[PDB]
């Protein structure tokens with residue numbers, strides 16, 4: 001592991017509650033001069049784009065998901081935790097003509 | 113809104129080179145870039161690069177430049193808004209550090225600031 | 241110039257919305273009769289369009305904003321996944337059912353606009 | 364909707380002035396020739412109307428206020444005893460003599476309006 | 487009135503620019519066919535003019551100011567030695583080469599005007 005973009009390690013929640021996962025790196029990958037994409041990614045399988053351009057969701061994404069980007073970090077909140085939210089989440093910094101600088105993952109547990 | 117089926121699970125040994133396929137269907141293959149990502153047992157996810165089925169353009173991360181052979185076919189139109197194409201992924205100096213799951217990812221949009229963002233993923237292929 | 245006459249037919253709606261006056265220019269005895277027939281038909285379809293733009297308050301506009309709020313029953317799609325993705329031809333195949341409903345919504349907003357404008361200049 | 368196409372023909376001018384776009388829509392070989400003839404005539408009478416609305420500054424209007432003060436020589440009747448009593452057909456039979464005089468008054472006010480507007484944007 | 491229909495053909499452009507609605511009014515079987523042919527042709531040339539005025543933002547104008555700065559390559563002549571000397575017919579024989587170039591300049595200014603106007607009403 002060598003990702004320059006750190007997340008909130010791991011975090012947990014309970015049914016009906018809301019979570020939040022950080023995402024921040026140095027001045028070279030975050031944030032006021034870079035977009036941020038949030039990916040739901042089960043272990044070694046088919047991922048899913050959740051949020052691009054800091055606060056825009058992908059098609060069909062449930063309104064529970066939300067984003068926010070300050071000048072030094074971006075956050076992914078998961079309103080109304082449902083049982084199908086046990087997985088790991090990664091972020092990514094990018095512009096129009098660059099690549100996805102991924103994050104260090106944040107496994108989320110909904111045990112309740 | 114279409115499928116991106118890839119090859120099987122072909123495992124070779126260091127120094128060699130492996131070809132990974134990525135056949136499209138159900139969406140205009142020329143309208144969206146094709147990205148290549150992987151998750152190796154040793155790091156997390158790593159972005160490798162994308163290619164344009166229309167512009168023929170290539171942009172990869174400097175970490176995978178002098179190792180990746182990335183190409184595409186030319187879509188076979190099914191309808192006015194459908195097509196079927198295929199992207200190809202090869203690597204040069206192969207090792208056991210590169211062992212992991214690989215997929216292709218169709219771009220998000222056709223314009224704006226999030227055009228190439230890997231939206232639609234394939235199925236995954238296990239390397240060496 | 242730009243691409244030309246319909247050159248952005250398979251282009252994104254964002255790029256296609258620019259330079260719309262290229263398709264606004266070129267829009268207007270067995271041989272003689274069948275030549276004059278097409279001449280009268282052309283003026284008809286064109287006038288039907290200007291007729292609509294007139295009873296919408298857009299007479300003389302290429303891009304014309306209105307009052308009717310966009311009903312999500314027509315399409316629950318973002319501005320982003322339309323103007324930077326769908327082509328103009330894809331789009332109106334999706335609005336095809338609701339096109340004759342919006343046309344009625346635009347006429348009431350123009351009739352109920354000058355009706356209010358009439359009260360405005362009474363003072 | 365409202366009553367329909369001409370449905371307020373015998374209605375008061377006050378109620379008839381509402382929803383005028385219902386009569387603004389439906390305004391635009393022996394059989395073939397006599398069918399094409401009516402087609403060309405229709406476009407003519409319609410364009411003659413839009414032509415007038417253009418040289419009056421009302422091009423694109425359904426209700427259009429102007430500058431010409433209402434001369435009482437045309438009719439010394441109140442706004443009340445017109446728009447809440449007379450029907451549109453009764454009214455213009457009364458203005459029938461003065462209709463070709465007001466038409467001239469509206470054109471000078473549009474020509475002497477853009478002539479002044481020209482001086483306005485010289486600064 | 488004024489002089490009449492084209493009465494200021496050999497008059498100065500300054501006096502001719504006044505009362506332009508006199509030439510805006512009168513602008514719109516062997517005998518039958520050659521009579522209907524002229525009828526369809528008339529509506530065409532007229533609509534081609536209104537078509538241009540529309541894609542210039544002048545739809546409904548007689549005198550219409552724009553944005554395009556007057557290039558001196560077209561004519562390095564003063565406002566005085568034009569509008570108080572040359573007649574309208576003399577003038578456009580001088581601009582005859584550059585007339586199809588200015589026409590293109592007027593359409594971009596109308597397309598790049600409503601494109602900006604679109605951004606204006608987004609707030």
Ligand SMILES: *[C@@H]1O[C@H](CO)[C@@H](O[C@@H]2O[C@H](CO)[C@@H](O[C@@H]3O[C@H](CO[C@H]4O[C@H](CO)[C@@H](O)[C@H](O[C@H]5O[C@H](CO)[C@@H](O)[C@H](O)[C@@H]5O)[C@@H]4O)[C@@H](O)[C@H](O[C@H]4O[C@H](CO)[C@@H](O)[C@H](O)[C@@H]4O)[C@@H]3O)[C@H](O)[C@H]2NC(C)=O)[C@H](O)[C@H]1NC(C)=O
Pocket residue numbers: 096097098142143144145164165166167168169170171221222223224225226227247248250251252
């Ligand atoms: C037909 O349909 C196809 C597919 O739908 C259209 O092709 C796509 O067009 C869109 C918009 O025009 C492209 O998105 C843009 O991508 C550029 C990235 O280009 C830059 O980076 C490249 C890699 O680093 C680089 O190759 C480019 O360099 C030039 O040279 C190549 C040589 O191949 C040339 O092909 C390029 O065009 C370049 O000229 C370049 O440095 C990105 O920069 C864009 O973002 C900018 O613009 C948007 C507005 O458009 C703005 O919002 C941003 O903020 C930023 O300013 C934009 O993302 C897409 O890459 C194309 N290809 C796909 C989707 O596969 C094509 O245009 C259609 N043609 C017609 C006629 O309809």
Ligand SMILES: *[C@@H]1O[C@H](CO)[C@@H](O)[C@H](O)[C@H]1NC(C)=O
Pocket residue numbers: 311312313
């Ligand atoms: C949307 O349209 C439907 C009919 O198609 C109508 O019943 C509904 O009230 C409309 N909603 C809004 C918010 O306009």
Ligand SMILES: *[C@@H]1O[C@H](CO)[C@@H](O)[C@H](O)[C@H]1NC(C)=O
Pocket residue numbers: 333334335336337
């Ligand atoms: C329009 O109506 C038809 C009815 O058969 C339906 O099948 C079609 O899906 C509708 N189109 C849209 C865009 O809703």
Ligand SMILES: *[C@@H]1O[C@H](CO)[C@@H](O)[C@H](O)[C@H]1NC(C)=O
Pocket residue numbers: 434435436
């Ligand atoms: C009314 O019209 C007559 C001619 O019909 C005219 O002589 C008179 O000056 C006009 N009066 C007003 C006030 O406009």
Ligand SMILES: *[C@@H]1O[C@H](CO)[C@@H](O)[C@H](O)[C@H]1NC(C)=O
Pocket residue numbers: 456457458459460
């Ligand atoms: C119009 O003129 C005729 C002339 O015969 C006259 O009889 C009629 O009363 C006039 N109409 C009006 C409304 O003054």
Ligand SMILES: *[C@@H]1O[C@H](CO)[C@@H](O)[C@H](O)[C@H]1NC(C)=O
Pocket residue numbers: 557558559
């Ligand atoms: C004038 O027009 C010429 C072409 O006829 C063009 O090259 C030049 O840039 C123009 N100058 C100005 C000031 O518009």
Ligand SMILES: *[C@@H]1O[C@H](CO)[C@@H](O)[C@H](O)[C@H]1NC(C)=O
Pocket residue numbers: 579580581582583
């Ligand atoms: C137009 O072009 C012709 C080319 O033969 C030239 O002779 C003429 O002088 C030009 N007219 C003007 C007004 O420059």
